[PDB]
């Protein structure tokens, strides 16, 4: 039996650079063609990958010492050094890089002072000792820090490759040097290609565990086509939603898996948009969304209504084991929507503009979700026109970064199992704060390191919802058909979704 498969993806690859990759498709690819110090296991816990063991923690929980294993290698056969990591991380925090991942490094001493421009990037409290030892100093004890070290943003990059390619690093398949279970062997255009192939990396330190010779990927935007290909043996998986999920729900090859992933309506609150600057308008939008109808009828695939910004089944209190997301903080209420809208009309000039644009990805169900929301908003906010604008993923990312939007159907999947993975995105000058929400009291609640941290973060979530700085819609369930012959693929509800390292084909 040939060890090959063709799997699916939701968008083209957007980045091949750890420093700049922030979307799920790019991150899944990087999790499979590259590797970091730690890699998540089947329980979403960081286990030693390039690192030879868990960190040795000293200095009252603030100093982490990590040893790189003997035989950890780049695809060109050269050793991965501690210095590769030092330079890689300096590169992420360097303001010249303009990395969307800079906030992930905030725990490390001087990362804040580098962000303000008070200090140079060489002050980042990370150093090599010899070629194989890393020492890191944190500002304070940070229980999830080993989890951060498993993220693609913390992956090394090869110093030689970075020196060679400079600003063109990651421009194409030829301008990277990787170190993972697979090599990227076919990818024509970053940002545009609907197909790519990865192949077993024989220079990978743990190549003995890898069975697949190659894995092909195909972007699927139209579910009917994915299913038809799947049934003809032209795809080994097919994504499902709506009527398609309804019909395949009882199939032996069907599964649905709940993700730590909230889809939002992000709202431009910089002042450019006069409607979304008004708090009553934002609250009207929130109350107008019939989340249960969306998930039952439109998605119908194990997705669930949002109860807050933070999704369910992600983070549990160490002391009492309670889910963080244990309060119903948002809920459909048509009459309150109508009333908040009537209140807003008294405060704004409707002559100027009574219209809101909604950006969505141009895939089948993203467009359909946008149209569902359009009808909900138009039905409860009398006189409001909502336009839906489906666009390609690379254009969508750029417009979010530039705040060239009004409303946006976009979401976040937790990178690690703590509420702060979500809540940090709404901090005043966070790169992921696309809407420009700013509440200084929210910012401060996020900094709590006391025995009451859990409670303080919940207060922050409530302040965000009370201001209605972002509208949570639904928590994503991933439904699909998958051929029975596919074995041992690791699927994660947090971080990079798929790990194909130990994948194999049986019968």
């Amino acid at each position: 039996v040939e060890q090959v498969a063709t799997l699916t993806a939701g968008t083209p690859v957007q980045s091949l650079d750890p420093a700049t990759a922030v979307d799920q498709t790019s991150i899944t690819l990087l999790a499979n063609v590259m590797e970091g110090l730690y890699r998540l296991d089947e329980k979403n816990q960081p286990q030693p990958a390039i690192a030879a063991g868990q960190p040795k923690v000293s200095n009252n929980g603030k100093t982490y010492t990590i040893v790189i294993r003997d035989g950890a290698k780049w695809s060109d056969g050269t050793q991965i050094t501690a210095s590769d990591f030092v330079a890689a991380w300096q590169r992420v925090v360097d303001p010249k890089t303009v990395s969307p991942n800079v906030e992930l490094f905030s725990a490390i001493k001087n990362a804040k002072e580098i962000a303000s421009g008070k200090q140079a990037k060489d002050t980042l409290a990370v150093k090599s000792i010899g070629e194989k030892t890393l020492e890191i100093e944190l500002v304070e004890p940070t229980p999830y820090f080993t989890d951060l070290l498993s993220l693609t943003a913390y992956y090394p990059v090869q110093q030689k490759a970075i020196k060679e390619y400079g600003k063109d690093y990651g421009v194409s398949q030829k301008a990277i040097v990787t170190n993972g279970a697979f090599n990227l062997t076919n990818l024509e255009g970053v940002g545009t290609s609907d197909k790519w192939t990865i192949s077993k990396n024989k220079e990978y330190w743990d190549q003995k565990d890898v069975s697949m010779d190659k894995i092909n990927f195909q972007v699927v935007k139209e579910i009917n086509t994915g299913i038809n290909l799947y049934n003809d043996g032209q795809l080994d998986e097919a994504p499902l939603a709506g009527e398609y999920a309804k019909q395949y729900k009882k199939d032996k090859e069907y599964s649905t898996t709940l993700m730590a992933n909230t889809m939002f309506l992000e709202m431009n609150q910089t002042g450019e948009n006069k409607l979304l600057q008004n708090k009553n308008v934002r609250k009207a939008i929130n109350y107008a969304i019939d989340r249960e109808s969306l998930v039952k009828k439109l998605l119908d695939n194990g997705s669930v209504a949002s109860v807050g910004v933070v999704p369910k089944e992600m983070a549990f209190n160490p002391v009492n084991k309670k889910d963080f997301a244990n309060e119903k903080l948002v809920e459909f209420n048509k009459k309150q929507a109508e009333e908040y809208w009537d209140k807003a009309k008294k405060e704004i000039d409707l002559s100027k503009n009574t219209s809101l644009d909604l950006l969505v990805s141009d895939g089948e169900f993203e467009k359909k979700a946008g149209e569902f929301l359009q009808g909900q908003l138009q039905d409860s906010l009398e006189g409001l026109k909502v336009t839906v604008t489906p666009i390609p993923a690379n254009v969508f990312m750029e417009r979010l970064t530039k705040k060239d939007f009004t409303l946006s159907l976009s979401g976040w999947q937790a990178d690690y199992a703590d509420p702060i993975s979500f809540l940090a995105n709404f901090e005043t000058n966070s790169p992921m704060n696309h809407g420009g929400y700013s509440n200084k009291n929210y910012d401060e609640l996020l900094k709590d390191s006391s025995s009451k941290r859990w409670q303080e973060l919940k207060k922050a979530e409530k302040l965000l919802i009370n201001d209605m700085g972002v509208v949570p819609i639904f928590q994503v369930g991933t439904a699909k058909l998958e051929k029975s012959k596919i074995k041992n693929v690791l699927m994660h509800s947090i971080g990079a979704k798929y790990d194909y390292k130990k994948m194999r084909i049986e019968k």
Binding site: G10, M263, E366, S410, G411, W412
Partner: peptide
């Protein structure tokens, strides 16, 4: 990480 697509 950012999710522009959910199916």
């Amino acid at each position: 990480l950012v999710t522009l697509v959910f199916v």
